[PDB]
Amino acid sequence: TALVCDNGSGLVKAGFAGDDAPRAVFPSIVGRPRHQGVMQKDSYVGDEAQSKRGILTLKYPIEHGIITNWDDMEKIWHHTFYNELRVAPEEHPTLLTEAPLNPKANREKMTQIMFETFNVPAMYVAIQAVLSLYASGRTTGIVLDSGDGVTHNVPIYEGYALPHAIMRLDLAGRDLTDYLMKILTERGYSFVTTAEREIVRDIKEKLCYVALDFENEMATAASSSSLEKSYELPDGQVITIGNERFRCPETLFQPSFIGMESAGIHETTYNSIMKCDIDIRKDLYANNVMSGGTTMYPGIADRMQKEITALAPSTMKIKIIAPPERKYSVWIGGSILASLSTFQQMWITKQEYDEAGPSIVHRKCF
Amino acid sequence: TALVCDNGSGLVKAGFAGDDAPRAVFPSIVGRPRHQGVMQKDSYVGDEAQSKRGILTLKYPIEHGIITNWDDMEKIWHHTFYNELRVAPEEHPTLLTEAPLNPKANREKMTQIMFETFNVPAMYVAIQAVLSLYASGRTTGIVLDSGDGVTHNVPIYEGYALPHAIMRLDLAGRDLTDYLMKILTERGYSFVTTAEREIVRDIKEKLCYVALDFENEMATAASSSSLEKSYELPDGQVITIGNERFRCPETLFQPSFIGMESAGIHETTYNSIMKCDIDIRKDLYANNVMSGGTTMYPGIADRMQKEITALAPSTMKIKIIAPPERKYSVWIGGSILASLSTFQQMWITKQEYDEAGPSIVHRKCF
Amino acid sequence: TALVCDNGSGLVKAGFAGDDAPRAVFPSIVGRPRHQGVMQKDSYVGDEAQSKRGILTLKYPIEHGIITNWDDMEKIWHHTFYNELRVAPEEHPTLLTEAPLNPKANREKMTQIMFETFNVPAMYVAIQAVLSLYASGRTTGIVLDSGDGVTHNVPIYEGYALPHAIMRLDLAGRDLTDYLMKILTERGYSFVTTAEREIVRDIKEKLCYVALDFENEMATAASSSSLEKSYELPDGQVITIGNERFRCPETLFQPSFIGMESAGIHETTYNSIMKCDIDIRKDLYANNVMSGGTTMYPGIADRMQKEITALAPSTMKIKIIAPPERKYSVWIGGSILASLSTFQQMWITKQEYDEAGPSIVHRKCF
Amino acid sequence: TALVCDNGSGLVKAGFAGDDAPRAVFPSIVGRPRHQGVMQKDSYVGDEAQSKRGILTLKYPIEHGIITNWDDMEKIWHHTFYNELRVAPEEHPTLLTEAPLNPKANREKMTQIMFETFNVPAMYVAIQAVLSLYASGRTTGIVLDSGDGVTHNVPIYEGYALPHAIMRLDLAGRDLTDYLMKILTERGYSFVTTAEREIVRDIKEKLCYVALDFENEMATAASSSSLEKSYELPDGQVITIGNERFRCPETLFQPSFIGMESAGIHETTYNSIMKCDIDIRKDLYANNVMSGGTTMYPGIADRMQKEITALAPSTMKIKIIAPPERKYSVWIGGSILASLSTFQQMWITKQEYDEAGPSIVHRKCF
Amino acid sequence: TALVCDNGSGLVKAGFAGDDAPRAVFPSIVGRPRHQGVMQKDSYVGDEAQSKRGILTLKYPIEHGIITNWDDMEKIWHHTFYNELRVAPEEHPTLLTEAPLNPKANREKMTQIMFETFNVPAMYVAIQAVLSLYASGRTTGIVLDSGDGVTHNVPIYEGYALPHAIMRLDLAGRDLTDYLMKILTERGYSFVTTAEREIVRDIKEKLCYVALDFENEMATAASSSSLEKSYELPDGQVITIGNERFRCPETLFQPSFIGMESAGIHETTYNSIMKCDIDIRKDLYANNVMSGGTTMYPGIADRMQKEITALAPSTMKIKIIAPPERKYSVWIGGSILASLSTFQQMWITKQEYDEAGPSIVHRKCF
């Protein structure tokens, strides 16, 4: 059986091809002690680093889909194979994922590590948005995947990708967390350390939602208090947040909140459709597929429906497809792809890698 | 029973001899993917290529009645026999059509393919304008056939053709479509790709008409807006066109609009009549038969009537015969001819082709 | 004296008729602050917007030769007359330029602004490729003008234009800049904002060249490092690019690199010649005139020479005329035309415009 | 004339707009007797509390730029207006200051007290780092202000602020004083009470300096005794300190000395520049403006110059601007701003406050 | 086997590593005759000085954890090795203890005496609060150790110490004894000499307790006499004390009783927890470990539980761990540490001390 590992900027999703859900889902963090030991491990990975985060400095080795710390990324892969899956890497072909429009050296160095450090028999690097379309059981649609580091649009029609219409935005979940940390100081709550950033991320996942009409929601939160909710910190302190609940996800539709010049995810989706041939736009309008953890905000599908309907012609039928399991769509699609009998010819074996060099990994890639 | 296949520059009309209408009518196009497949057929033909045209490059293998791409033309014949008619070619004699004054190698290579690739028992290549006269139930008349690639005049008197009065013009429907694409840029509408050319062709067939008086119509369209009509694009966008509706078909009467030096179809018809013997001109004036898709514009028979009346003597009775089914006149006439008991001696059998070479196909031909 | 203003998609070229070079050459941009002022002008134009681009959102009011933002285009004309030329518009007749096959409303609204906002005494809108032939001192030749927004071919023979052989391609310098931004992400360089697009444009103008043989050049850049060059960013960072230097201009000859279906500039030039009368093709083959900033790549004349020689008959003499000042050929030709005594009758005066309406501006136009 | 009051965490700087220096500079402390009176005022403020600190418990009402004790903060404002300036608050508009990223209720409650307790005619709360740029006579630069409670970086370019690049660190002078108290116990000196903390603060301001190379300085202080200096306590005891002189200010560059996870002021300045647009970084590198009392250590400008030069590209010109009067830069800039004729429209009058509520005070604020 | 010597300000605890209790526990006093001998030893140490205290002046060589009289401290170490343990110092490695935040010269001079006067083979100076956590069998908790001279809080999480949250208070048992001597004069009991201070210390250890509610206890002692207890002096006189029983230990929670400005041990514990990372506070709240003789008052754990519960959030579980043997926790923990096989590498041998100087003793120290 094959291994399917979706190495996100925020979460590692790993498991075996053929399963319906990832077996191991843990944060993609490496923690190191920042104080002084007197009574000890040198570094902690994943959920272990999360439970000891009070005395650790937490580091993400992947920033915006790009692996920045290769020594820490190797610890995460080692932790995934031996501690989470309890499997031998040299026995299973490994399907990895990557964001589109990544640097070419990122995929080449990832292939060298899988072949020379873990000695996998074969491997393959897929494009994440293509796997998301496999998970939804579709051959046509424009995928909006938004994770912790990358937001990208990839239109696909009848199984053919349109690489020249691919959009990529370096605004995702981690940028929303940093923005929530900033606007929480308006109420006197100060989250500074990397461990406290994990607390704000948990606040974001529990209380934040997307307002259908932002300016109408801002007036409601300013008049009454029915939108305010409480949250208990790990030390028992209770904080209360009001309009911060929908101001944080609003950055997805107004990236100028964090000083970015780019357009929101609704305009980016519409611009990607308008770059496609006029004869496929009707099918793309009816098959907007959302995937990734950042699409899990309550009300984001209704907001995307409203914003794209206002941009598209009135006779087009806009349909946002947001299944409940879309947070793992990339992994689920990779599990379906790695189980296809037609796919078994696309594995890049160790023998082919020794005779073709690193350039063999850049095929069917964009 | 015999097969009747009218392979036009734009449409394939195929069916069985004895029927009243073609069984299979589909565009004579071959489409190939122009992007990149990630999730597939290599090429699509006819209506299948039309429905997937958003991700295809569309190619017409026939240009101006002349087969240019023989590999693609073979795919269209294969698609016609096995996908559209669901018939075995080696069981039916096949009546094919051709425009007059075509290159001799076009008919010879078409005969070699029918005998050696499809192994038809017998075949025959008829002249299209002669079949149009069969469809109208006439033995005398001058036929003006205008399709997608060729416009030609053929006078026939009491069953005798006058080959030396045959006119041929390489201005037809596809040239009007390209001209409509050009003058639509005046309103800011940009159709460039081969898939968008199919959209303009649909605009032409829905909204374009022939003005009875062109300069009087240009003044009306410049003064008011009663001639403007809207059209909804496949993606929901609505375009509005005014004088482009009658400027496009006006090219048939003023070929200088597209830079051609030739005379319009009315002058070409009159010149063909004036090259005929003076004793048959009265019968030709009263039997102007129009056929083909490009004669389907509203008001073209009234315009032809007016233009030829102004050229002919005042005592001649000009009569334009334009039946409602004239878009399939060539096929209907070929269905009548292939069902005649007198015609059964004109079949070129496979045995006669092996003993006489390709030169046997050039009999009763011009 | 007359004003000659070449309003390109990328650069404004303005000056006085009779001069040898434009007096004012500045980018056709309008910048507006995108942050928040605390210590201010509302908008900046041209070189002023270029020097402050770090805190501005830069907007081009002309896209593909078509004016899209008329309020911003009016700011550019105002900046041209009063800040760059320091002249009174109501004292000089103004010769403007336009790309062929533009929407008719573009030229009409441009005439209304010049007569009612700036109150010019007279004006005239010339066709750019015709002016390029004036600059080269020729009466016969096929002009390939490629600027920031439009690439077009216009054949002219003995002073007569052939409008039905005019080609227009919406692929020019700005599309090459966007493609260079895309393929620079392969090396981990991320240019996203409109200000960073100006940096990539500067990279393109300094380092990009046209390879004589593309596939042979790709093998050289993949084997060694002699083609790699460094470039210092405004903040002191040094980037290094290799095959991106010739992959970006290769899009001119292979528009499928950016997903366009059209043919390259060499095939478009050859197709335009083949649409012309056979008796003028020999003179067009020997007078290929290149103009515009996008024809300034090193090696593009040698590549065009090689590609057209491979398409034309072996006995034809292909000659590419590429003078060193061809980046301003449209302006230089407009300066020659506006100084001709024969041209002084073609000025459209304010009095003629009030009595003939906007339709007077569509004369000698295509 | 207007009042300019810079209420710092450590010092109150108050005076009149138009002057060159604050008229009243006193510690922002409230002292209350902690023993028992037998022979009396209930509380002492400022320099009076400083001279009687032996029998007082000293309290700072402002912690890390945030007013914590509003009853004590009201005593300080009352002491400022009536005892230090000898002025009537209801006759002068008052310009107050605040650190960026403060809680919103801090500025709202400060406005309510100025309007309802002191009945000022108008008021305005400025951002401190913006005023520091006014004092230096610049429109572009990144300000590093470090006082007693807050250290913050604010980049400004051509008069436009970049709020999304603003850094704030809760490490300043009071944290260095507490760290000096801790490391003085290594030599057997025990400072515990709030009155003795004022003695350590005086030691810090007299003897502490920033080492150019910390590890090289630690080796010199460990080998000889040329770095040791003596200090006479208020009771005549003489203490001698060696490497504590530069270990205390080193916390600014290594916040891990006091257990903070954040980066030093040099890395924070460089990170703030790298978050800004690439086109403004060159101007920010050349205009590093330092302000506040914590930037008054000898050798801190040379150390900042060295640390940022090691982080920035080698071709950038790093220039630290540290004027001798930078300890009062916020007040001096507020004195310049309150004297501008353009600023007289930004006063928030008492009438506007009664009709717009407390929300009017959050304009041009971050 | 190793020697474990806990040299407190009040008691010497000495024994061998591996044992469960100290073998020698005696007061850390040196007594010298203060009258005139007529019928004799020059000085007495420990229990011998205690039994002859009537004719001696008693001196403590350690004040507030700091060795003040080095000649007398050497007599105590000599008495410990040769009279109490009857052991040869040059045969056993010696584990010594020290309070945190002590002067550096205290530990250096103690190391020089152990190596040059007693010629121990190896030695090590541990931090007392860390040893207290070893004794309780915990890896996480905040230790409140209160002896005769020093009270300090040290939080430890999962074996990692947080030195920047360490509190130290120079208020312990000897200050409570001096306060009891003062308030006993209210009943006419006069204890003045150093020998009578030992009697008051015995009164404190027998009769003093911590009141759960101080003001409610003061009302009970003022209304009735059920809280009064008698104590027989060495000469047969019987004294009776009432509210002095709980007023003396109340100084631990209200240090202002003896004129100290610091906060009580409950506020100091809570402040130390609040300086720690928010993610470890829940574990520190549940693991408050008390050690030392001054934590042996009846009712001090219930009072600490009540005071910290009133400061902490209501959802936190406050748990005070006070084992019955906590008066020797530092020694018991040092006996466990010196018996660990992992610790045998941390011994500072005499050879390492001769080659590294006194600076080797400051490792893993704060």
Ligand SMILES: Nc1ncnc2c1ncn2[C@@H]1O[C@H](COP(=O)(O)OP(=O)(O)O)[C@@H](O)[C@H]1O
């Ligand atoms: N219920 C939720 N609501 C909002 N955001 C969520 C939710 N669950 C997860 N996220 C966000 O999704 C991001 C990561 O999701 P994922 O798609 O796994 O990203 P990646 O694949 O890049 O690691 C995190 O930043 C997290 O904050």
Ligand SMILES: Nc1ncnc2c1ncn2[C@@H]1O[C@H](COP(=O)(O)OP(=O)(O)O)[C@@H](O)[C@H]1O
């Ligand atoms: N209703 C219509 N009005 C105008 N043109 C039409 C109409 N229907 C078909 N056509 C044109 O007729 C042309 C093809 O007709 P046809 O006679 O089948 O040509 P061919 O036989 O050469 O394929 C096409 O170019 C199409 O645009």
Ligand SMILES: Nc1ncnc2c1ncn2[C@@H]1O[C@H](COP(=O)(O)OP(=O)(O)O)[C@@H](O)[C@H]1O
């Ligand atoms: N040396 C050069 N090499 C390549 N491209 C260039 C060079 N100089 C200018 N260009 C390109 O030419 C384009 C604009 O030239 P121009 O002919 O003025 O266009 P327009 O007239 O449409 O404004 C710009 O996109 C610019 O990038």
Ligand SMILES: Nc1ncnc2c1ncn2[C@@H]1O[C@H](COP(=O)(O)OP(=O)(O)O)[C@@H](O)[C@H]1O
């Ligand atoms: N010469 C000096 N050297 C070092 N630190 C100084 C000096 N003078 C003042 N300080 C420190 O500056 C801090 C306060 O300066 P200031 O900028 O007024 O802060 P705030 O505005 O927050 O009150 C105090 O903590 C003080 O210790």
Ligand SMILES: Nc1ncnc2c1ncn2[C@@H]1O[C@H](COP(=O)(O)OP(=O)(O)O)[C@@H](O)[C@H]1O
């Ligand atoms: N039962 C008790 N109740 C109250 N205090 C006690 C009791 N037993 C001992 N003490 C006090 O504990 C102090 C010394 O204990 P210890 O922890 O050994 O201190 P050190 O280690 O500093 O010598 C003495 O001041 C003594 O008065």
Ligand code: BEF
């Ligand atoms: F890396 Be995640 F998918 F943004």
Ligand code: BEF
């Ligand atoms: F080929 Be069609 F009949 F013009």
Ligand code: BEF
């Ligand atoms: F507008 Be440029 F001439 F392409």
Ligand code: BEF
């Ligand atoms: F409050 Be100070 F300016 F740090």
Ligand code: BEF
């Ligand atoms: F010296 Be004791 F432990 F207070």
Ligand SMILES: [Mg+2]
């Ligand atoms: Mg992902």
Ligand SMILES: [Mg+2]
């Ligand atoms: Mg036909």
Ligand SMILES: [Mg+2]
């Ligand atoms: Mg141009």
Ligand SMILES: [Mg+2]
């Ligand atoms: Mg300040």
Ligand SMILES: [Mg+2]
């Ligand atoms: Mg002790």
